[PDB]
Amino acid sequence: NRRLQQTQAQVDEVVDIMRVNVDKVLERDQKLSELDDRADALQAGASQFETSAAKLKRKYW
Amino acid sequence: ALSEIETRHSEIIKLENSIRELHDMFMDMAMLVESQGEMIDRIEYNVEHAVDYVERAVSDTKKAVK
Amino acid sequence: MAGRSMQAARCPTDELSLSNCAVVSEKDYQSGQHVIVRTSPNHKYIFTLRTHPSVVPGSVAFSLPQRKWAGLSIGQEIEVALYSFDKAKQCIGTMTIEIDFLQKKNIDSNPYDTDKMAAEFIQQFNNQAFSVGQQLVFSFNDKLFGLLVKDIEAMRQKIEVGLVVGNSQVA
Amino acid sequence: AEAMALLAEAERKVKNSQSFFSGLFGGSSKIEEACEIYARAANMFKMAKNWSAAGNAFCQAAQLHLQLQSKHDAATCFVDAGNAFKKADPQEAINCLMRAIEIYTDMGRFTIAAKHHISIAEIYETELVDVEKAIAHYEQSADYYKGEESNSSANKCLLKVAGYAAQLEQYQKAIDIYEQVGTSAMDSPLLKYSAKDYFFKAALCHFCIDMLNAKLAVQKYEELFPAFSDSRECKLMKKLLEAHEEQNVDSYTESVKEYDSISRLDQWLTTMLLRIKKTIQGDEED
Amino acid sequence: AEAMALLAEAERKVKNSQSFFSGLFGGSSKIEEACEIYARAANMFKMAKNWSAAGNAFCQAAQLHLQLQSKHDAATCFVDAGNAFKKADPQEAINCLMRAIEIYTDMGRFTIAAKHHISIAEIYETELVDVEKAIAHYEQSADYYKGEESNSSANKCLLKVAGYAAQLEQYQKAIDIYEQVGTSAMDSPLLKYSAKDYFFKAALCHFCIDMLNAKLAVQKYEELFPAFSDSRECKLMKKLLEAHEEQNVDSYTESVKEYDSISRLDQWLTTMLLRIKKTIQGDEED
Amino acid sequence: RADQLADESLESTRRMLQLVEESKDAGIRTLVMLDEQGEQLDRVEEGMNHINQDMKEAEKNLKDLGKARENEMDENLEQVSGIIGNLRHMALDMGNEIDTQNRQIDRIMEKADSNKTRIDEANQRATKMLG
């Protein structure tokens, strides 16, 4: 009977951990999401700049 | 004693399923680790590429003055 | 200090009714202090105070048993003043009480261990004041009773009002 | 630092220049400065917790950005406007969000278009409570995800679709979704585990089923008795199918009580179980 | 390549040029150079483990950066300074951070404003020990997170707010927070698992309530025997509510003794359970 | 009754072992991904610094142009106990990994914005030098 209640809380001990782990995946949701979109809009404003730079090249080179 | 084998039962069933709930988390979590593992596939993609566009930007600008 | 005007009221809840303590406000007194109520130049009574943020500032609440003893009515003026006992001549050691059932439709002749009573009586009415001829209600095992001080002895001289301490023997 | 003042200057500069103002060149150079103005305004409006004001301010900055020729950072502004209205007192949100997608969609940014699309229906269901327009979005969005190779997300959306489709009565249209999301879930041994619930749902959904559509979805199922996970899916189902085919609103309602022991019934399940619970009673009483 | 050397040249560089020095032009070009200098110094200062010097060095480069008009990267430098002083021996750990947020806030950067807003409230508690000022920050920060729809972090912060609000006697103002974060958690079939603890806390927090605020919150909670996660929330609670309504400080203290076996009590719970045990004792022998 | 109380519990202990062991495998995959995903980020960090360094070079040049049943059953228990207490091992490890990357992402998001705003300034400071 001892080994029984012994294993009980031990399992629950891991359950309490998953809790924190779940709170960790939520953080990885906020970051990736917003960031992935920002860095994605980066190539947009970066590409355009590379374009205008091409003009500065054909007039100053 | 019946009071033991019985208490054991209700306790074991309250031990396995206690893992069930935990098992459910490993399920959702794993499904999320792979889910969010997609964004990273784009992050790595964008990042390096963003450096390619910027690298071409810093080059032309420098040669636009020389 | 020297005395102030107060107004008699009714006990807040049945909770502070089984304590035999005069409930007052925190803006006036503080739980633990003793006072002496006055109704005439010869009728003086002593009670134990217990604060409760429900009492109205400038008034003391008494239970039915207490009002039937000190002759207090719901809506009269009384003068209350701090009273400090002298733990050297007014300490109760042996006090005889006339226990009795409070309700009739529940009066059973079954056995009642007195030891448990004298042990619970000092555990609930400790550091309090009692007078000869005082009437109150005793809550023993959720069973309502009635007490009536017959004689009080100091730790053998007879005292009017005493202070039930920890090492007090009740009979 | 005056929002009202910024909102004014922005106006005085947001207008196609001409004459002595236009000079030799101009155009986008001014309207952009104006956008920055309204943005700063909405910023302090949200600083003072006027949100509604901040939202409408972002609406102005966004609308102006379109008048410049920059759909990208514009749509992002529409988003900001949506986050504002949402965490505000007006209801606008929905509008802004729609105006956002039309951009991300026309631009080709389907990835993000779907990223928001799901939030769209998520609001059209948690706010406006208009599932009829929510499902349409969860669906059109899942199409985009499923197109971006992103299977996982596509499935999240499908789950939303089918899940709420059964609440609306669309049972068959739900089982189809469960079947598909079930056959497209085994290709990933990292999902097999959950593939159960899918079969459980597809077999629970009944479009006034009379035969073994469910008995067939439970038979297609591969249960492994030594694979204990399945104990929360078919084993129960079979007992329910019998309690249905035998007009017994007791064996079924008893099985729901027992299963409710080894496995807690969630909102959804409950609602549907009760629906099947009455399909039996009415049949005992016909 | 010497720290002091750089600091010196930096000084000779940072100064509005005038007279013979100014010549024909100048301005930002100089002050910027100085910024890079001090940064290069702060680098080797953190090397030799001077910290104090490194931190103050970053403060120099940062403040100078503002004198050039570049709030962005400046504030970031303010962060390097804050992190320096924090993991250093002098103070300023709090000032730098406030000086960083004052920038991220007005610049229209709330995403980050809250990121360091929580770090701030974390130091103002673990260091300065100013719970009353920490809560103000944990809160306003959660407000911003809620605006970014980052429900998660919003909850993280709210949990902090309520958690310390209960230690600060603010019991009722804590349960309200648990009710909100509790209702704003059921929406996600991933927080249902966590939504328990919220109800447990809210049902434990008592603003000296005489009615059944807890006997009501325990009821609002949906439990069934087949729960095993629930066994760590209301099952205990109900037994505590009866142990409070009966002034039995033996059934409450024995139940906390048994429950302290299947699920250990953190410092928080202990402090509150103790506070409730005292509301019972201080009411019995009295 | 002791006959169906122990046996059923035995079939219950079996469910535990497999559930955790089958979930631990998913845990491995998780850690396996956490490691990889970590490298993908240590590769993103290089970009943030690279972009902030190059943009600084662009601006300068740009502005320049501007200006026996109970026995074996008990045996399984010892197994379950050893597995669960082990489930924490990874549970904790995967925790540090996350907290680590999560912190790294913070520096990325920050610099990312600084670089974004900058690239926009360059674009605006580029359409004003033409002609």
Side-chain angles (χ1 to χ4, degrees), chain C residues 73-139:
Chain C
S73 300
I74 304 177
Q76 62 177 59
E77 180 180 60
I78 58 178
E79 299 181 60
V80 181
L82 300 177
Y83 181 62
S84 300
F85 288 64
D86 181 359
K87 299 181 181 181
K89 302 179 182 59
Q90 299 181 61
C91 297
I92 302 178
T94 301
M95 178 177 82
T96 301
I97 305 177
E98 183 180 299
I99 182 179
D100 207 305
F101 292 66
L102 185 60
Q103 297 183 300
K104 55 182 64 293
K105 303 301 177 59
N106 304 300
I107 298 173
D108 58 65
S109 180
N110 299 122
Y112 282 68
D113 183 298
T114 60
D115 298 300
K116 297 183 178 181
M117 310 184 103
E120 181 180 300
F121 182 62
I122 302 299
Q123 181 59 60
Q124 180 174 237
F125 304 72
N126 57 61
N127 185 60
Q128 295 183 56
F130 287 68
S131 300
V132 181
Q134 182 178 60
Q135 306 178 303
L136 63 171
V137 297
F138 193 8
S139 180

Side-chain angles (χ1 to χ4, degrees), chain D residues 11-39:
Chain D
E11 178 182 300
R12 299 182 179 181
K13 192 169 186 176
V14 57
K15 187 177 184 300
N16 299 5
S17 58
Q18 56 178 298
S19 183
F20 68 116
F21 200 100
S22 180
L24 188 169
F25 66 117
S28 299
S29 301
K30 304 176 181 59
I31 176 64
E32 188 171 61
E33 181 67 301
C35 300
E36 177 283 301
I37 301 299
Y38 286 132

Side-chain angles (χ1 to χ4, degrees), chain A residues 1 4-5 7-8 11-12 14-15 18-19 21-22 25 28-29 32 36 39-40 42 46-47 49-50 53-54 56-57 60-61, chain B residues 7-8 11-12 14-15 18-19 22 25-26 29 32-33 36-37 39-40 42-43 46 50 52-54 56-57 60-61 63-64 66:
Chain A
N1 185 62
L4 184 59
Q5 300 178 3
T7 306
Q8 182 58 54
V11 179
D12 306 301
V14 181
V15 180
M18 258 292 99
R19 176 192 300 295
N21 296 181
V22 177
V25 67
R28 174 156 159 279
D29 176 295
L32 302 180
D36 188 299
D40 193 305
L42 184 64
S47 181
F49 175 52
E50 183 181 301
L56 304 176
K57 180 184 64 180
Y60 290 111
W61 188 301
Chain B
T7 298
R8 165 182 286 294
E11 183 65 13
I12 295 182
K14 186 174 297 178
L15 172 57
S18 295
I19 303 179
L22 180 60
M25 292 184 262
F26 277 61
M29 179 57 89
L32 297 179
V33 180
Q36 286 137 172
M39 287 63 110
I40 301 181
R42 292 191 295 295
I43 298 179
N46 294 237
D52 180 60
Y53 301 118
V54 176
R56 292 180 172 293
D60 299 359
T61 55
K63 298 180 180 181
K66 301 178 180 180

Side-chain angles (χ1 to χ4, degrees), chain E residues 32 36 65 72-73 76 83 104 109 111-112 115-116, chain F residues 52 56 60 63 103 106 109-110 113-114 117-118 121:
Chain E
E32 187 171 60
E36 181 284 301
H65 203 184
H72 277 299
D73 315 294
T76 72
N83 298 0
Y104 295 126
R109 300 297 303 299
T111 59
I112 171 60
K115 295 298 298 179
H116 283 54
Chain F
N52 182 60
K56 185 178 182 181
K60 179 177 295 300
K63 63 174 59 185
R103 180 183 180 298
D106 295 304
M109 300 181 269
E110 290 303 73
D113 183 61
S114 180
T117 300
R118 273 181 158 60
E121 298 181 61

Side-chain angles (χ1 to χ4, degrees), chain C residues 15-16 19 50 123, chain E residues 247 282-283 285-286:
Chain C
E15 183 176 59
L16 298 179
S19 60
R50 179 60 184 299
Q123 181 59 60
Chain E
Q247 72 171 61
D283 205 308
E285 303 174 300
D286 200 307

